[PDB]
Design a protein around this ligand. Structure first.
Ligand SMILES: CN1CCC/C1=C1/C=Nc2ccccc21
Ligand SMILES: CN1CCC/C1=C1/C=Nc2ccccc21
Ligand SMILES: CN1CCC/C1=C1/C=Nc2ccccc21
Ligand SMILES: CN1CCC/C1=C1/C=Nc2ccccc21
Ligand SMILES: CN1CCC/C1=C1/C=Nc2ccccc21
Ligand SMILES: CN1CCC/C1=C1/C=Nc2ccccc21
Ligand SMILES: [Ca+2]
Ligand SMILES: [Ca+2]
Ligand SMILES: [Ca+2]
Ligand SMILES: [Ca+2]
Ligand SMILES: [Ca+2]
Ligand SMILES: [Ca+2]
Ligand SMILES: [Ca+2]
Ligand SMILES: [Ca+2]
Ligand SMILES: [Mg+2]
Lengths: 199, 199, 199, 198
């Protein structure tokens, strides 16, 4: 009855990282950088806004737990001051909106904890998880969960299509967004799952 | 330890409406028209985009139930084509954002049903319910409930403040939004409730 | 020697209306609702039989002309099925029927045109314009003029009193009647004029 | 311009031999329009009545001969003004057609003089109606001023449209005495109904 919709690099496991708490600063394969406010430069450093993957592995300093799934999470970090805009990840899927279907989008959202190289990761920028059809946002979870420092929680976004939806046949999309509402303005995501069930 | 946050005209019971299925075309008292795309004119007619209150009482042609609370609901109707923008209701409260507090916003959202002499009320434009602090959207439910033709369902939006939140001491706010993602592009709200509970 | 008999609100200009195609749903001031079949309720809505005044200004969707006189017209719309009865406007004048006098009553009658979101204004219910003395209809034009969609035409009713008329000294009166013989079952009136002239 | 057929349109049936003589029974081809039961089944000279009258050479009642042929059709109502209305009705075989301008004409007579001590001064008012089914499409309710001893031609106009509700219903004619005043007799003659494209 309930069907899994394929998503590329849904657990950010690509690329493989060898040393715990190491990370990349380039867009994860299979994802695009959602950049409506042009906060993330094409060429990144550890100083600029950036995104990529990080290995949340045995004895990680940043969390009270391992990655929700496999080795890695996907992160978005924004250097600009709170209120300067939003950015994150986007992926347009091969699947299209079908009529009389219940879509359930689940993503794990992480609030980084601790102190590293004299930098405090206390605080949280807010998140939004969006399900798209074309570039319409069908349904979204704008920051409803409370996520304690050093944990992940599962966001759930749901849409139900009717027989005559205007967006039928448009490609489904997912956006994972750093709201940059506060500092520390890094946000982690993991284990994106999307299911469809005929109504 | 749960506390009610007072909201003016929270069930749109002002003004009194005498005749079932009658309605106003002016901003309900205590509310303002959220109008970021200027879709709703200053001077409204029965022919234009409009908002107001509407009596969903015994014998309603619009619903398979009465108003969620009292006699009336607040409606926002947009005449423009899907994707023209959004509009709805906004109210800024006296209450301010306090630390270590779980805020819970609930609102009933209505999908109007039926026909009238060639007019069709089938379909639904999408909703979003927002909790604000100042100009910031702290949390929002963007269209996650599926709502059948001729029913209301309760949307719940939640935010939890920490001790160090950047928006502490700013005025809480509520926005009820017609997404205009499809037609028929009327949307109803009722029974707005906001509670605050120390963590 | 042609004298014009004063009629209150003869051109439906009270009340003043700001917005083109806006309208009241209350009997126009100076008039009463002629309601022999009780088709028009005391409290009217968008969904009921109604009457009132309507602003036909530059840009109106209803007519290929402006109002015959000033800004406004007086309208009567009947929701009930054709054959259900008649309704409209009546005004009893201060003037009385005098002997050996030619009476000329003129009124412009409007047939609405067009379409609104599935609603059609195509068709016309028939009109009757009546000159009264007391409760007696002295003369009436029952639907003799062909009125094209989106235009007004002038109806003229004539009565010549003799020295021995049964009704001498009775109060003159005017009735503007929606016949409800077909649909669309709204029609409009404007610019009511009554003159008296010694024979 | 098409002539729509009407039976006994001139009230020429029945033939009357003596000038100013008359019948007191419903003219052939017509029915008595009687919504208020003012006219009895059995009529005398004292009751409300209807019939035909020979307005021939030297007629006492008019300044002219019948508008058409020998006879007119009359309606007289004995009841007091305001008691109601009565007259003649005929349903035709022709039915309402769209995009058509219908013109109904009838001459309407205001009887004059004194006869056996009765004054015919005054006039009850008239209404000429065009019908489709039992709907009055159009009517002249007493718009003409008719002088004592004259006939004047009443004209009733209706224009049909493409989606008229009454398309295909039988056309009909009513000639009505309004009983608004006395003397409360009313005469008609020369009923003509034409049709032409819009
Ligand atoms: C030098 N900068 C800019 C601010 C944060 C950052 C990091 C460098 N390594 C990191 C590892 C984990 C989280 C943040 C950083
Ligand atoms: C916020 N930033 C900036 C650079 C890397 C980083 C991480 C966020 N979560 C992480 C988990 C594991 C390793 C690194 C990061
Ligand atoms: C969508 N619109 C436009 C005008 C009023 C209307 C209503 C919506 N809900 C209602 C409930 C009761 C009465 C009217 C309305
Ligand atoms: C048929 N109806 C019912 C409600 C209003 C209306 C109008 C008719 N002519 C009008 C001219 C101007 C404004 C409104 C109307
Ligand atoms: C005896 N009565 C009472 C009512 C009218 C009448 C007439 C008798 N012959 C008539 C000839 C012409 C007109 C009227 C009458
Ligand atoms: C008003 N009444 C009642 C009985 C006869 C009648 C006539 C009316 N016109 C007439 C013309 C010629 C002859 C008789 C009548
Ligand atoms: Ca992972
Ligand atoms: Ca943190
Ligand atoms: Ca309410
Ligand atoms: Ca609906
Ligand atoms: Ca006017
Ligand atoms: Ca029309
Ligand atoms: Ca004849
Ligand atoms: Ca006479
Ligand atoms: Mg309150």
């Amino acid at each position: 009855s309930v069907v899994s919709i394929p998503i590329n690099n849904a657990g950010f496991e690509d690329p493989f990282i060898e040393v715990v708490d190491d990370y990349t600063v380039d867009t994860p394969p299979g994802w695009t950088t959602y950049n409506p406010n042009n906060l993330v430069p094409e060429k990144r450093t550890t100083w600029t806004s950036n995104n990529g993957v990080g290995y949340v592995g045995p004895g990680t300093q940043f969390y009270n737990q391992l990655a929700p799934e496999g080795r890695n999470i996907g992160y978005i970090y924004l250097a600009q001051k709170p209120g300067s805009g939003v950015a994150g990840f986007e992926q347009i899927l091969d699947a299209t909106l079908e009529p009389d279907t219940n879509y359930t989008l689940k993503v794990d959202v992480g609030n980084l904890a601790g102190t590293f190289k004299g930098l405090s990761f206390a605080g949280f920028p807010g998140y939004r998880v969006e399900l798209l059809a074309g570039d319409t946002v069908l349904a979204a979870d704008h920051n409803n969960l409370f996520i304690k420092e050093g944990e992940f929680k599962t966001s759930t976004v749901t849409y139900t299509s009717t027989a005559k939806d205007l967006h039928l046949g448009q490609k489904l999309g997912i956006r994972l967004v750093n709201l940059l509402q506060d500092k520390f303005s890094g946000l982690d995501f993991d284990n994106v799952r999307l299911t469809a069930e005929p109504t």
